[PDB]
Every structure is written in C-alpha cells, then in structure tokens.
C-alpha cells in the first residue's frame, strides 16, 4: 500500500478501503475514503483549471479544524502545489508577513472567511477563494468561476519556525517528506483501518496535521473533527466514544487540561484505547502516570519537530517494547546520532546534540544559506536539542541548547525541574527557567500555578524541590501565578515567562 508520495499513498488507501470511514465532523459529516478521495480530486481539478494553480505554486490556507481544510489541503498538494496553512488568529500584519515570505499566490478560506487574512491578501494582490462543503451529493463549492502525476520532490507543505529569537525560518516540505513521515507514524503505532481518533490540536502545525490527520488517512483509519473546529475538553470524550476512537495524540498541556476535566467531571465510563500519545514538549513522568491511571491506556511519548516533518522518535507499543518515563523512545524510519561540538558520535549515556538524517527531513530552510550551513552536514540535521541514548537505545532529552541553565559551570535541565514541580500535590502547572545571575552567571527560577482551592508558597515549593533535587538545581525564586501563557500549539515558552517575571 506504501508510496513515496502522500497523494499516491492516499489513492492506494482509497482504492483498498473505499467504504471505510475517513473523516467525520461531530454531529454532521461522515465521509468515506472513496468520497473524500473524489472530493479532493474534483477540488484539485478546479484549482488547476479555474484558479490557475501551476506545479510549484504556493497556496495559503487559513481555516479552523474543518472538513473544508482537510479537503482543500489535500487538493492543493494533489494539484502539485505547496500548501501553506496559517494560524487563523493572526493579525493582518502577521498574515501579510507569512503570505509574502511563503510567496503564496492564492488564499483559501471558508465561506465565512477571515478578515485579517483577506486584508493582507488584498494588500498583496493575492487572490482569495472560499471553500464550502454542502450535501453529500454535491462537490465542494469553490467561489471561483466555472493525469496529474505527483512527484516525490514536489513541494507539498510550507511552514515556519517559531522565530522567537530570530526571524521565522521557512521550512519547505515535499510529497516525499509527508509520505515518509506518514509511513513512520503508521508503522510505529501500527495504525490500521480499524483505528479512529479525534483531532485536539491545530492542523496548521505538524503534530496535529501529520500524526492526527494524515497518518490516520494513510492507514485507512478514521479522523473526527470537533463540531466547533477546535479542541474542547467538554466534548472530547463524548466524541471519542461516539466515533469509536482507539487512540489520540496531544501535547502535555492538552493532556493536563484533559486530566483536570477528569478530576472535575469524571466520565462514568471511558473507551478502551490502544494507546495515548504525547509529543511536542517533554512529558513529565507524573503526567504519564496520571493519564495511565485515569484512562487505562499505555501512554507513549514521542519526539518531533517541523524540520523532521514531525516524528523523529517514539516509545514503542507495549507489544514491541516498554515505554520509559522521561524518555522519548527510539528513532523511527530515520538515522539519529548524538554528536559533541566536534561532530563526534557519543557513546551511550554521554550527552550531546541530537542529529537526524532521513527522507522525512527538510532539504533546508528556504532562501537561507547561513541557517542551512549551520544546521546541515552530509545529510545530518542538528535539532538544537541536547540528549543521550541509554543502553537500550532509548533517547533521553536534556533540553534545548539555548534553554539549559549554566549555574557556575553546572548545567541545569529545566525539564527535570519541571517534572519535579509537577509532582507536588498542589501544583497545577509549572515552568523552570534561567535568569541572569551576578555570582553564577545564570541562576534557576521557576513559576507555578497552584490547584484551585489550594494555597502554595514560594518556600513550600522550595522545600519540596530541595527534597527532590540536588541543591544546585533548586529554584532560588518561585513565582506564584494564576496564568501561564501558551502558544496556539500548546507550548509554554520559557524565555517569555522569564522576562515576564524578572524585570
């Protein structure tokens, strides 16, 4: 069933499992693989004939998590074009920047549209076209008037790095990249046509897009989108039950929200899942434990990033091997090595930078010779993460190179301290971070959010940490707070929190 293009793979799947469920919208749609396939074909043909889309063209998309987004994303890549999904919550300025930098030639939205995006597009003289799915007997409706062979080297997906420190870097991903990652993800979790999941992550980042959506479709499995096009803790388990879900994937903060929902409003019964997946940010062992005890499924942590078309490594299914708390498992379908600054491969349990090489990895940042020279060598990409392999070949992350806290020559891992903080009975959320320090160069601080109805002090936290950490690792200042800002993808950014609490 395998192919070296995502479109080819999806065609094979559609032909093999035409009547199996592919894509649901809770309470509304239930598209089969054949139906979805033909909707995509007709939409792509419309893009080519009526929207003037040529091979290599970039088409921007800004949608909530909707059926129209799925259909139009796959239609764009089918037409040999490059899809550039964008955060719908962007301002007109942000939209203008990302539209310009990606050289988008077309903007796709729903019929309801997106005012900042349309403003940016109008300013840049980029055409705007809407997409709407009506009844099951009609093709997707496009607002434009009136033998395609996909090449593995065709561009298919264009995204950007976060660009906190620097300018956001463009990440071009190919049909081959997508196919490779879909195959890796399907392989390591043994996704088959009987599987089913609910999307709880934004589809304009690779976690939700590749793992949640594309790999499921690539397995002939089913995907359910929440009715309101976004994660909802309230409707999550009802959707999971109603549409026969067998797994789900999310980031730790989302898992935390789900656990809180389980504490406040426990379901009388939970469906028996094959596994629960976590990725995109370190999962504290205590969160793993709480998830497994609450929902009774094995929790598998994975390690991924945009430049790798998501998946780099994962803990295996229980039938294939154990899953280790504190670890992100073994590389899947790609090479991975731990290198010191001199480029030498490290022995087990020796730290260094995680580097990868495989058909899932981007060929390089768009129009950025510097970043590519710095990031790539002989096919190997530098992730920016420090980690080590244990004797079983399981990867243990230590943290972002730029985030490690150098206290008087002794490097502190914020991940470890975060985990410790989350083990405190009255701590709802927590984040450690480096701050300037006169004596030690850098010092560790942290911020925590107490569980509602509980009271926590700085020195409670400090005492607990001192009880669970070597003295030099203990946060010298603990900031009690009510809110910790998160990205759309669900990440807490250490530098931002730091700045926020330091001056």
From Swiss-Prot:
Oxalate binds at residues 280, 305, 310, 491. It is found in: Cytoplasm. Gene3D superfamilies: 3.30.300.30, N-terminal domain of ligase-like. Its main location: cytoplasm. Its cofactor is Mg(2+). Residues 232-301 are annotated as: SBD1. The modification N-acetylmethionine is found at residue 1. Disruption phenotype: Decreased and delayed seed germination, but no other growth and development phenotypes. Increased sensitivity to oxalate-producing fungal pathogens. Residues 302-365 are annotated as: SBD2. ATP binds at residues 161-165, 205, 280-282, 301-302, 306, 385, 400, 491. Its EC number is 6.2.1.8. It catalyses: oxalate + ATP + CoA = oxalyl-CoA + AMP + diphosphate. One of its GO terms (cellular component) is chloroplast. Coiled coil: none annotated. Keywords: Acetylation, ATP-binding, Cytoplasm, Ligase, Magnesium, Nucleotide-binding, Plant defense. GO terms for biological process: defense response to fungus; oxalate catabolic process; positive regulation of seed germination; seed coat development. It comes from the Eukaryota. CoA binds at residues 230, 409. Optimum pH is 8.0. Induction: Up-regulated upon infection with oxalate-producing fungal pathogens. Signal peptide: none annotated. Oxalyl-CoA synthetase acting exclusively against oxalate. Follows a two-step reaction mechanism, wherein oxalate first undergoes adenylation by ATP, followed by a thioesterification in the presence of CoA to yield oxalyl-CoA. No activity with malonate, succinate, malate, acetate, formate, lactate, glycolate, glyoxylate or glutarate. Required for oxalate degradation, normal seed development and defense against oxalate-producing fungal pathogens. Belongs to the ATP-dependent AMP-binding enzyme family. Both substrate-binding domains (SBD1 and SBD2) are involved in the substrate recognition, and are sufficient to confer the substrate specificity. This is Oxalate--CoA ligase.
